[PDB]
Design an enzyme around this catalytic site. Structure first.
Site, PDB file in Angstrom:
ATOM      1  N   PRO B   1       0.782  57.617 -35.325  1.00 44.39           N
ATOM      2  CA  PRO B   1       0.365  58.066 -36.660  1.00 44.39           C
ATOM      3  C   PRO B   1       0.837  57.108 -37.746  1.00 44.39           C
ATOM      4  CG  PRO B   1       2.193  59.377 -35.878  1.00 44.39           C
ATOM      5  CD  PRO B   1       1.739  58.548 -34.710  1.00 44.39           C
ATOM      6  N   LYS B  32       3.823  62.986 -31.043  1.00 43.87           N
ATOM      7  CA  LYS B  32       3.330  61.659 -30.740  1.00 43.87           C
ATOM      8  C   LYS B  32       4.511  60.786 -30.340  1.00 43.87           C
ATOM      9  CE  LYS B  32      -0.885  62.455 -32.443  1.00 43.87           C
ATOM     10  NZ  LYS B  32      -2.217  62.033 -31.935  1.00 43.87           N
ATOM     11  N   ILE B  64      -4.796  61.006 -35.479  1.00 43.23           N
ATOM     12  CA  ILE B  64      -5.916  61.585 -34.745  1.00 43.23           C
ATOM     13  C   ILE B  64      -5.499  62.942 -34.190  1.00 43.23           C
ATOM     14  CG2 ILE B  64      -7.523  61.293 -32.844  1.00 43.23           C
ATOM     15  CD1 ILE B  64      -7.174  58.295 -33.029  1.00 43.23           C
TER      16      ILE B  64
END
Lengths: 117, 117, 117
Positions: B1, B32, B64
């Site tokens: 990210p 993540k 995402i």
């Protein structure tokens, strides 16, 4: 188009004239006139890229019509990586790009928006 | 990210190592890997937040899949406020966050886009 | 709303108090309370606008509900150009604006998102 480049390279490690050379590069890559290319470079920042604080750079590219597909963004990415790795003396692992489509009603110029120009 | 943090705190009032600690924090909050977290900190800016020029900070988070819902962004917000209020010595009234979903065709890495990786 | 202003004017050529005056200006232009306006000014950058490195500025405006149409963005643009040309001593050829609609689930405040406030 609008290009914004953040980097943790100090200003004195960003080669003089980069913002002008990036206009010429973006013109050829994106198929837009160089006199409609805008570049903003923000050096000397504190950055981590992929978890690492080694020298790195982040490029954002915004434009009408030309940055909305995977297939053409793949081409744009290849060319911008070639330009930036050499200009900034950075490896390909130290650069990331984001692409942002714009519409004409989002761009304010000369006191109106592009929808009416 | 991708995390971007603007602040009017001078660089010497942003604790050393913040960008690395924000990678670890974002990894746990967003689910993540820390080695895929990117952080950009831009200190020493001129800022007003909620009309006031007292010390403040603005965080933008792009990713995402994980920053597209109110319910999960509520969770992310709580955790990032906890992290930033303590790290920056700012009250909760002096921080705002914006969340931006990304698609794979928007992320340029290693000379291509994530659609093809 | 969220206003971000990048400029290659050095900090000492951006008039003192601009960020507060931009809150008042944005409040009247956008019809939002001044105490909900956020302004970030990033001076001293390296910029080209329309291919030229002469003094220039880029404004981004993000808000719920009010920056999503061509017709009203045309009005907003006129007013912000009036404000910025005079404040920054820049011609209308040296400023560009981008408008970004936001939704409530994108705005993190006080440890939650606006969807729940």
């Amino acid at each position: 188009p609008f290009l914004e480049l953040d980097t943790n390279l100090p200003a004195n490690r960003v080669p003089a004239g980069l913002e002008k050379r990036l206009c010429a590069a973006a013109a050829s890559i994106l198929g837009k006139p160089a006199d409609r290319v805008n570049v903003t470079v923000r050096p000397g920042l504190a950055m981590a890229l992929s978890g690492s604080t080694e020298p790195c750079a982040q490029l954002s590219i915004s434009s009408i019509g030309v940055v909305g597909t995977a297939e053409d963004n793949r081409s744009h990415s290849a060319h911008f990586f070639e330009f930036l790795t050499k200009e900034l003396a950075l490896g390909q692992d130290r650069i990331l790009i984001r692409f942002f489509p714009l519409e004409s009603w989002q761009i304010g110029k000369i006191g109106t928006v592009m929808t009416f120009l």
